[PDB]
């Protein structure tokens, strides 16, 4: 069977869009990510999510935002969607100032830690590298 | 009685584990472009896994990197759907 999607609201869609990184990280700026963030805003507005866009967050602001949202009351929401646009490596997403572990972010939403989302689908969409391998393809 | 605390997550990764993810400096990341296009066309028709499987095909077949640096040129990408979900997901 299939998730109940007819709660009063579809749920939150949180978009963390990190374009500009501190130069101490040695990370290039991610030009074009603004087009992505706006594409995602319109797409999820059309599916009835309350979209909240965040821009250039440090790893501490990422952790803190994720904690605060996980303590909101989602009782009347059907789902939860989180979009992370940043640099990354395997298991890791970068705030503007350093890496933060993906499992640190998702753990706030575990079934035992976010009771008002237990049994509801939690979607994490992750635009970021996961290492340095190159796929040369085959014809 | 109870469910795993890890159940009911879905991680839609833009790229296979270990690999680079590609982004166009003007049009956005291959993966987000394709995800928004597929949602717009199919979110009132298809289940989420099947929308995401169409994202996989679009990225895999329509995109190839263009780089003035040969090391980064003519590369490919397959997104990576990771589902601990326990039911099908329909957006309408």
């Amino acid at each position: 069977n299939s998730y109940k999607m007819d709660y009063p609201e579809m749920g939150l869609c949180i978009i963390i869009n990190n374009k500009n990184f501190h130069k101490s990280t040695g990370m290039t700026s991610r030009s074009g990510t603004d087009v992505d963030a706006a594409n995602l805003r319109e797409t999820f507005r059309n599916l009835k999510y309350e979209v909240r866009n965040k821009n250039d967050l440090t790893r501490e602001e990422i952790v803190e935002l994720m904690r605060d949202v996980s303590k909101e009351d989602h009782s009347k929401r059907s789902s939860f969607v989180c979009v992370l646009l940043s640099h990354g490596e395997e298991g890791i997403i970068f705030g503007t100032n350093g890496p933060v572990d993906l499992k640190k972010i998702t753990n706030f939403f575990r079934g035992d830690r976010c009771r008002s989302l237990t049994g509801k689908p939690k979607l994490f969409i992750i635009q970021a590298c996961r290492g340095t391998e190159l796929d040369c393809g085959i014809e | 009685h109870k469910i795993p605390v890890e159940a009911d997550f879905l991680y839609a990764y833009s790229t296979a584990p270990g690999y680079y993810s590609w982004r166009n400096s003007k049009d956005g990341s291959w993966f987000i472009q394709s995800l928004c296009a597929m949602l717009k066309q199919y979110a009132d028709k298809l289940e989420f896994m099947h929308i995401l499987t169409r994202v996989n095909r679009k990225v895999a077949t329509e995109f190839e990197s263009f780089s003035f640096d040969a090391t980064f040129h003519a590369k490919k990408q397959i997104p990576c759907i990771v589902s601990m979900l326990t039911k099908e997901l329909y957006f309408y």
Binding site: - | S14, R23, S25, F66
Partner: peptide, 5 residues
Amino acid sequence: ITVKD
């Protein structure tokens, strides 16, 4: 141009 993330 294409660039990596």
